[PDB]
């Protein structure tokens, strides 16, 4: 993550991020809506950061420092570039919506009144097809990635030293290889929870309540399709084991 965005999302809530003289100008219902929208953007910034640790710290470090067999790094980090592209673009749109809403003379005081339209755009058309295809591939390769990691850590000394070295800093405490993989798999199922709570506090404008209701429906359709398209791949699986499912 970059310092500007980390500082903008350092507070535990929107009510603590904005100036107290700005907070006092809003109704409690607007504050509750903004606290949940702030949590969605903050968790998206963290999710994009998890993908950057996977691509830049782990993947690139293994390619430039280790002598692994070809196709081993891809097996540990399936679809990470496609996932980074999807979420970095989504994050850019959320952060631009926040930026446009800032008051002149402020870098922290804003109210986002129109999130629904951005969520419908993200969870419909080509971007939804790309998310569905990429998560169906990633989640089907999840178990294989974890097993490959465990095999490499148990049998390769240089791999163990590499992992222990790059995961040593306290800021990486929650972000080991297996932890990153599960954080990415669990991300998609956080969206309906966040969207439903934003919707609970967005009844003031009927257009907004409708847009968030449509967005919630699209996210659920996307999740149902991903869930139906998953079948765990296993290294060395035989065709007979596959067609006897």
């Amino acid at each position: 993550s970059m310092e500007m965005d980390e500082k903008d999302f350092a507070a535990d809530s929107w009510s603590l991020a904005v100036d107290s003289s700005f907070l006092q100008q809003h109704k409690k219902e607007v504050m509750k809506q903004q606290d949940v929208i702030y949590e969605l953007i903050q968790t998206e910034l963290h999710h994009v950061r998890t993908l950057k640790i996977m691509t830049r710290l782990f993947r690139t470090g293994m390619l430039e420092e280790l002598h692994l067999e070809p196709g081993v790094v891809q097996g540990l980090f399936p679809c990470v570039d496609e996932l980074s592209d999807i979420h970095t673009r989504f994050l850019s749109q959320l952060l631009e919506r926040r930026r446009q809403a800032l008051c002149p003379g402020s870098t922290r005081n804003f109210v986002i009144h129109r999130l629904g339209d951005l969520l419908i755009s993200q969870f419909s058309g080509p971007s939804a097809e790309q998310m569905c295809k990429t998560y169906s591939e990633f989640c089907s390769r999840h178990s294989k990635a974890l097993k490959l990691y465990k095999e490499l850590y148990a049998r390769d000394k240089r791999f163990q030293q590499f992992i222990r070295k790059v995961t040593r800093p306290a800021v990486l405490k929650r972000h080991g290889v297996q932890e990153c993989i599960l954080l990415v798999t669990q991300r998609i199922t956080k969206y309906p929870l966040l969207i439903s709570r934003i919707l609970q506090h967005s009844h003031g404008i009927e257009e907004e309540r409708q847009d968030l209701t449509t967005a919630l429906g699209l996210v659920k359709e996307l999740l149902s399709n991903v869930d139906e398209g998953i079948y765990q791949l296993e290294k060395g699986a035989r065709l007979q084991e596959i067609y006897n499912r």
Partner: protein, 179 residues
Amino acid sequence: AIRKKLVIVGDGACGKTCLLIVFSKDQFPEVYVPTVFENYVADIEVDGKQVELALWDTAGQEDYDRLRPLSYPDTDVILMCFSIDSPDSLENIPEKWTPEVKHFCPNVPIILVGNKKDLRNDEHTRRELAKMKQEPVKPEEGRDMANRIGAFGYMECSAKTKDGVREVFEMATRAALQA
């Protein structure tokens, strides 16, 4: 410090997310209670042993039978949650959550946890449940269910007041350590 993995399971309104938030947070959430929990690695010292306990939530995965099991690999301890204000969350334990956890986490200790124990003496809770011919889950009903499902143990807590929260995670650490 040895690394252990904990996963919490249970119905959507069982309070599992709130329990993980209250345990992990430095300072109780007085201004905003988060909607979701990402992960956390708690430094715990129980009975003289230091453990790094990775904490994971299954919230949002309840309707997705192929995504949800991806949370289980290499779990060392399961917290199986129900809400004391919801006798229906306790009924879903033996033939929905228990067979799933036994299948994906064989030989992993399960601690059955009754959440929201503060609502057992809440008059609004008692009036609402009485309309559907119900009452808050009794301590003996929780213990009997834990006994029936082969749980390692039975515990109660309140995320709202923090009572019993530290004890649940210290016991989970002890269960994860047993060979």
